[PDB]
Enzyme design. Structure first.
Site, PDB file in Angstrom:
ATOM      1  N   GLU A 101       1.280  17.891 -20.319  1.00 11.87           N
ATOM      2  CA  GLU A 101      -0.161  17.648 -20.277  1.00 11.87           C
ATOM      3  C   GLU A 101      -0.662  16.968 -21.558  1.00 11.87           C
ATOM      4  O   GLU A 101      -1.888  17.010 -21.789  1.00 11.87           O
ATOM      5  CB  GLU A 101      -0.955  18.947 -20.016  1.00 11.87           C
ATOM      6  CG  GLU A 101      -0.452  19.664 -18.762  1.00 11.87           C
ATOM      7  CD  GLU A 101      -0.450  18.874 -17.458  1.00 11.87           C
ATOM      8  OE1 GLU A 101       0.338  19.184 -16.588  1.00 11.87           O
ATOM      9  OE2 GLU A 101      -1.316  17.954 -17.351  1.00 11.87           O
ATOM     10  N   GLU A 120       5.969  19.754 -16.936  1.00 13.42           N
ATOM     11  CA  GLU A 120       4.576  20.041 -16.837  1.00 13.42           C
ATOM     12  C   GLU A 120       3.846  19.471 -18.057  1.00 13.42           C
ATOM     13  O   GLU A 120       3.088  20.176 -18.684  1.00 13.42           O
ATOM     14  CB  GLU A 120       4.244  21.539 -16.719  1.00 13.42           C
ATOM     15  CG  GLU A 120       4.977  22.275 -15.622  1.00 13.42           C
ATOM     16  CD  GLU A 120       4.440  21.995 -14.194  1.00 13.42           C
ATOM     17  OE1 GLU A 120       4.853  22.702 -13.300  1.00 13.42           O
ATOM     18  OE2 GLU A 120       3.633  21.108 -13.970  1.00 13.42           O
ATOM     19  N   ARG A 169      -9.083  14.675 -27.790  1.00 14.54           N
ATOM     20  CA  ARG A 169      -9.540  13.543 -28.551  1.00 14.54           C
ATOM     21  C   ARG A 169     -10.073  14.075 -29.875  1.00 14.54           C
ATOM     22  O   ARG A 169     -11.204  14.566 -29.932  1.00 14.54           O
ATOM     23  CB  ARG A 169     -10.721  12.871 -27.783  1.00 14.54           C
ATOM     24  CG  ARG A 169     -10.230  12.099 -26.537  1.00 14.54           C
ATOM     25  CD  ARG A 169      -9.304  10.939 -26.887  1.00 14.54           C
ATOM     26  NE  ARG A 169      -9.270   9.970 -25.794  1.00 14.54           N
ATOM     27  CZ  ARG A 169      -8.552   8.857 -25.872  1.00 14.54           C
ATOM     28  NH1 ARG A 169      -7.735   8.619 -26.914  1.00 14.54           N
ATOM     29  NH2 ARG A 169      -8.639   7.949 -24.910  1.00 14.54           N
ATOM     30  N   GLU A 205       0.323   6.449 -18.270  1.00 10.16           N
ATOM     31  CA  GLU A 205      -0.508   7.652 -18.266  1.00 10.16           C
ATOM     32  C   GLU A 205      -0.386   8.429 -16.971  1.00 10.16           C
ATOM     33  O   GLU A 205      -0.658   9.645 -16.974  1.00 10.16           O
ATOM     34  CB  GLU A 205      -1.990   7.290 -18.499  1.00 10.16           C
ATOM     35  CG  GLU A 205      -2.151   6.710 -19.916  1.00 10.16           C
ATOM     36  CD  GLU A 205      -3.577   6.707 -20.401  1.00 10.16           C
ATOM     37  OE1 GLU A 205      -4.519   6.639 -19.637  1.00 10.16           O
ATOM     38  OE2 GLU A 205      -3.686   6.789 -21.686  1.00 10.16           O
TER      39      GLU A 205
END
Lengths: 159, 159
Positions: A120, A118, A45, A77
């Protein structure tokens, strides 16, 4: 009664007499428990320079009501769908912004979308709420409002 | 890495690449229970056009740590002092602002400052948390994040 200093992508900045006001789209957040773990998410963030513990969340888009946005955010999400129940809402910081968050419970979760590779960009973090609260107390992770609301709601109503 | 569009009284607006960021002072909030009632406060909030149910709260001023700000806000908004314990913190909306709220419990409250006249710039609203939650469920009052956190914390840990 408002004068606009800036009109942006998720926010506007306005003055209203002496008051500095940030207009912001409304949001949703989804509390979900499975096998005693809560569904947290983390992402970098830039406003805070770290990745706090949140729950699945995001902005209500044009045409959507809060329930639909909650469904979408859960799927986008985390790749999950569930049966959603509206809980309550809150203004994130009514001293300066009108952002309002609508919070839902999700039950009976199913994986509908596979988690690619993977990836992220949004990290899926299943964690017992008791462990999330201990890690926070230890200074090890920060909360967003949505993450803290999820933890407190669990301790109040889901044990 | 940030460019400022506006530098204000409680906030700055900055761009960071694609990200719109509102810098804001950190805040405190105080959860207090007496005789089964929680200490809520209400004030007109021009950003939202209504007075949500909050708990005593405000910005940390220069020189203060969160504990000191919590003491001050409790006294200024309600005329009370108490024994304060740090609970936890949260980022109000880390998708766009860095505002971080530090939440305290207050116990053993005493009135130290009289409530002048019938002043309702900040209204003191003692209310059972169960009643606050019912009123909200009925659509009768809105919550701030701090008010909702107080209600949930009570149901989780103070019954």
């Amino acid at each position: 009664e408002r004068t606009y200093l800036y009109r942006g992508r998720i926010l506007n900045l306005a003055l209203e007499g002496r008051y500095e006001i940030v207009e912001h789209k409304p949001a949703v957040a989804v509390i979900a428990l499975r096998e005693g773990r809560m569904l947290f998410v983390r992402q970098m963030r830039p406003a805070v320079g770290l990745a706090p513990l949140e729950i699945p969340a995001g902005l209500i888009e044009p045409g959507e009501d809060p329930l639909e946005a909650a469904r979408r955010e859960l799927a986008e999400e985390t790749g999950l769908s569930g049966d959603l129940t509206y809980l309550f809402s809150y203004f994130v910081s009514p001293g300066f912004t009108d952002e309002k968050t609508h919070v839902f419970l999700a039950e009976n979760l199913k994986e509908v979308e596979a988690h690619p590779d993977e990836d992220e960009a949004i990290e899926v973090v299943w964690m017992r709420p008791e462990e999330a609260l201990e890690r926070h107390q230890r200074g090890e992770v920060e909360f967003s409002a949505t993450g803290l609301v999820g933890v407190l709601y669990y301790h109040a109503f889901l044990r």
